[PDB]
Amino acid sequence: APKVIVFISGSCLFGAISRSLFKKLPIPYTVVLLILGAILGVVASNVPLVEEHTRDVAHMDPHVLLQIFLPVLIFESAFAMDVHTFMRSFSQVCILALFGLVVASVLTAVLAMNLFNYNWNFSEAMMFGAIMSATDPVAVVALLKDLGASKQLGTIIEGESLLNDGCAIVIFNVFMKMVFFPQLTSTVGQNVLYFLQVAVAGPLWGYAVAKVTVFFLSHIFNDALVEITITLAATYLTYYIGDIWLEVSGVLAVVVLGLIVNAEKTSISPEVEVFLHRFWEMLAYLANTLIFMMVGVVVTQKALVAVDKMDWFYLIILYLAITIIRGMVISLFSPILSRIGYGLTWRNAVIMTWGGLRGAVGLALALVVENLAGNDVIGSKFLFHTAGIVVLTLVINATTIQTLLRILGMSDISIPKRLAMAGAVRRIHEGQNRTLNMLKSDRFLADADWDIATAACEISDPYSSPREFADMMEEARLRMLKAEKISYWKQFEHGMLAREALRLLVQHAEVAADEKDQFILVDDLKKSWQIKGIYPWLKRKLEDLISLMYKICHHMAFEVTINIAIVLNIVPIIMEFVVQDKMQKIEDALRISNYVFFVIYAIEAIVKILGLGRHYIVSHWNKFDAFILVVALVDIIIAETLKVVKLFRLLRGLRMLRLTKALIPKLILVVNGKINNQLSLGYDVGKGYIIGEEEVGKIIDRMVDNKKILRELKHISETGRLQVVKELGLLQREHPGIAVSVKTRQAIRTILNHSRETIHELQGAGLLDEMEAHKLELTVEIKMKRLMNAPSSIPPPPPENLLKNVSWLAGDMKLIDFIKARASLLHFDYGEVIVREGDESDGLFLIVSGLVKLYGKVFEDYLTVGNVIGEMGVLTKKPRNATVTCETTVQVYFITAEDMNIAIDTFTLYPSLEYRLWRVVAIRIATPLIMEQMAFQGWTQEKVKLHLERGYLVDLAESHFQFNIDATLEDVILINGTAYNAHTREEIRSPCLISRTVHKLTFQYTATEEPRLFVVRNAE
């Protein structure tokens, strides 16, 4: 019967009681956990039956304590952090945590040597400083996350805490091995090698196991428990193998592994993501509870038996000096911290000074000092001072950080947030009153008690002249910015934006609102999609790096065969190196003449592919293959003459060139993936700003009342939208394959999201049960996770594949053959004119490469690859509306008007080419009208487009050129021509939306009119 089970369960129950009883009180639950542990240790010192149950956990080994509790705490601190804002302010976090921890450890060591009466040397004092300077604030970061603004302050406190804890355990391990467990001597070179080993191979081993774990998690579908156990086993194996087998600081390895796993959360399924968040929070909570209970028991059993009044005096002075030292560290790093991103205000410096809550990490390190010291008093003094500092920091700093956050003015609720919460409470109260008025008129719920129902449903407020022209301009700018923020949140909620693009767009909107008269700036938004860096240069240089018998060897198999030769050469390289370093059957005849010249070098690379002259001349890879062959023949005649330098030259040269030639395209794929991530973020930010400008241009007529202010706001919005559109087109031009890959991924994601919504609508309507809909949801989730492992660079389709993928051409095959037979690829250079504004209609222009500019007269737009120009001019036989000028080198497919008229006249099935072309231009001409009608109703662009997609053009000859508008038709849009309405009360000249007062339509049949009508109905 293990007593540790009883102690662990009792600690869990004590922690649950402590959190359930001290939630309302401002003091933390860990302090009363320490108090309960002290009481339990007093009882164990009195009663031996309790001593038998507390002995196995109180007198635990230091090594198993570290190896069990440290990976959980370090990995949860790394996993809980928002890694985007952590990497955004990584410079400040890194310099503050690293250099402040170093100088705080030095100052605390000097204080421990000068103030304390014990004759401590520098090693034990530096151990004391490394234990004292490790900070674990969780209440402070929870308070900063909950109380409104300064989210950057919360994440800089969290990142500083994580790196401070990691490097503090590193410094503590260095000095613990300096003073306690060995006392060995070494040279300066071994010290340099040990510093290199720790500080470099910590994060390198963590990065290696993190990439292996990410590759393992990215290839697991429809299995959650495997992913959870892989995360847990990867954390524990990383820490154990790094700390024990590799003699490497495993704390930094778990820091790096947790930060990378938190960075690559898209390789984990979202249900597994939220389970992993809750699971690691639970594991760290259990670890903190066990550490604090164990610390209390051992403090009142062993660390309190040698304590005098001078120890308490030194504890008080140590607390005051620790707070002063941390404040002076932040104050002396304030110029350098202000000179880099986000700066540091004096209020944030005061919060970071006072938010240094000591935690379970320093308690565990003092525990292993106390257990490692043995019967010496240094461990008892260490654990007493650490327990006192933890208690004092927790109590005093928690209560005073609540009242200090109140006093400094960083906890005041903003006026727009308070007004939004008041509006939410008002709409909830209105909805509850309507629900109660519905419920009182029920049959079954008619004699229920309504006083109790109203008292239960009482959710309440948690927060309890040119000068006129300037004021109206400020009001209009503020209303426009609020509408832009609302539009960005609407885009994110509808499954269009990512989280990072949403955060960047609302950050730009807020910092535009804080200034005097500026709007959201395009130039500040350019840095999102500025893909320039070392990665385009790396991709360019690597694509410059790689650029009879031949027909035998082109079957992509002999390179795989020589890669098998690469690994089968690499293994005896290490074997011969190790055995000849440590120096049977003369190395078994030297691996039987290294596999008999390695099957005479795979029959001399199949006799240099039987002597391909040009291929072996023009390639340098074959040149150092020939260098390998002459070097290996030289080593063969060296073995005939028999040095080891020649053998090692053979091994080294073989392995290095073979691995370089293999690893070049994988490096190309990695660079393409990083460019893909940057391009996805930039495209999401740009597209979100564009559709936000479209929505804020739609809804601006209700808000803005003046005319000059509305004109200036429209001009500013149009200039910003045009600049972002041209920038995104040029960015697509710079990296074509990456842009095709990110557009393909976004298209697949949108299609699968709409399919998931269709499955939800099927299961909510009762036509599909829970099990079959869960099977279909599992199928679409497997497809989404395999979409996350897409190729990062899909090669761009040829112009024929773009010609067969047009919306009005895609279904048919004979029509595709006709268009491909009668198209014409025309090339244009920079600055030339494709068409002119006053010219007659001549044909369509499918853009297959490059960017154009439509200077319609004002009307400006930039079209890219995959846009057809001139459908309306071809169909309606009107003259051209816009002049198209090239912005880059543009290749277009020009189908002439005669060929398109012939193709329209021939193909007359039920989906006809005339019907498809008119439906495409009807969607294009009816989307802004429906957007104008339902602008204030909150309908987005994509919902309007998908609502319009269910519509269809009516055949007026089927209904004798008269159309009735019932309530069965959701919306009716006239596309071309004139019309008359109702009892011929007026004439409908416009292509605008039909008003709801029209009950009937009448069309005549004139020359050059051909009237069309696009109707959308509800679910019939």
From Swiss-Prot:
Gated by voltage and stimulated by cyclic nucleotides which shift the activation voltage closer to resting membrane potential. Not inhibited by common sodium:proton exchanger inhibitors such as amiloride. Its main location: membrane. Residues 643-703 are annotated as: S4 segment of voltage sensor domain. Residues 499-514 are annotated as: Interacts with the transport core domain. A motif (Essential for sodium:proton exchange) lies at residues 164-165. One of its GO terms (molecular function) is potassium:proton antiporter activity. One of its GO terms (biological process) is single fertilization. It catalyses: Na(+)(in) + H(+)(out) = Na(+)(out) + H(+)(in). GO terms for cellular component: plasma membrane; sperm flagellum; sperm head. The keyword Cell membrane applies. Changing D165A: Abolishes sodium:proton antiporter activity. Keywords: Antiport, Cell membrane, Cell projection, Cilium, Fertilization, Flagellum, Ion transport, Membrane, Signal, Sodium, Sodium transport, Transmembrane, Transmembrane helix, Transport. 3',5'-cyclic AMP binds at G870, M872, G873, R880, N881. Residues 90-177, 310-408 are annotated as: Transport core domain. Residues 814-895 are annotated as: cNMP-binding domain. Residues 469-514, 706-765 are annotated as: Interacts with the S4 segment of voltage sensor domain. 3',5'-cyclic GMP binds at G870, E871, M872, R880, N881. The dimer domain comprises TM1-TM3 and TM8-TM10 regions. The dimerization interface is formed predominantly by tight interactions between TM1 on one protomer and TM8 on the other. It contains an hydrophobic cavity that accomodates phosphatidic acids likely playing an allosteric role. Electroneutral sodium:proton antiporter that regulates intracellular pH of sperm along with capacitation and fertility. Activated in response to egg-derived chemoattractants, couples membrane voltage to sodium:proton exchange and transduces membrane hyperpolarization to cytoplasmic alkalization to cAMP signaling and ultimately to sperm motility. Homodimer; the dimerization is stabilized in the presence of phosphatidic acids. Belongs to the monovalent cation:proton antiporter 1 (CPA1) transporter (TC 2.A.36) family. This is Sperm-specific sodium:proton exchanger.
